[PDB]
Amino acid sequence: AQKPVDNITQIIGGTPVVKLRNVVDDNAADVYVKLEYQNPGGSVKDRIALAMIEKAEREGKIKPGDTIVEPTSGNTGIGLAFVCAAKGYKAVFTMPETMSQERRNLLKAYGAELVLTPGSEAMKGAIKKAKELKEEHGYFEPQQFENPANPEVHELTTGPELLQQFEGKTIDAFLAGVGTGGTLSGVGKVLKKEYPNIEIVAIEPEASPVLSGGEPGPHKLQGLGAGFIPGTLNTEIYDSIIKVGNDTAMEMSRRVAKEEGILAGISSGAAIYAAIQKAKELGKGKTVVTVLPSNGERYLSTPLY
């Protein structure tokens, strides 16, 4: 157990890794999952929320008490709300009015302010409004799809944690769902350096396969499928792409909760499905690693559970 800390943000990171036992066969590679929902705010996005705020503070762009703005309906808003409460900042989020009352309650429980934009305008409307608010009011915008501190924190923390966790082992393939691409890009850089024969695999929704060259579309893999290629994604880092359908991802998340006792979100079921497909290709004795971004408790009101 960690010695006492003065601020909850000092416990972000250092997340555990579990080997899967039942949803993958003894004929396939070993599959390991990094539990990023064990971060204190509940998802991988604690890491980038802390990193973007700390970099802007270190560059003098913000100081405690300042207000930030970000267009987000997902885990990054929860992450930024959590970090801003812990570090003494004020957070404003823009988002379409289709966001659940419970999700709103979570951001407001950390003290954030919400600015709801027209549902018919989806994320475009929220992005437009956040830029308007930034220019009118002087708010700092973290900009999770452009800020280099996003992939950099994964290069400094998440990736090197994996190198410590797998010392004396070879990772043969690392797979990650792409939302901002920061996880895949920063972890992948660190793992490719240490394990030059590793395969790095991007995961995206079948229904919006923009990295594969297809057109954006509506999909249900929350946390993935931005519909564009983010600034924070290194499109050279991955050797291949695995597309996952809505239903396939949800069926795997249900299997993993019941058969491994690991209760994770939709994007985690997509990651595990892809990792098992890759493990079958690599066969016995090899090592496949992926990341579970968020916990199934955040999805109890969705079709997943």
Binding site: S73, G74, T76, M123, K124, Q144, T180, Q222, A226
Partner: peptide
């Protein structure tokens, strides 16, 4: 739309 997306939830990120």
């Amino acid at each position: 739309d997306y939830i990120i």
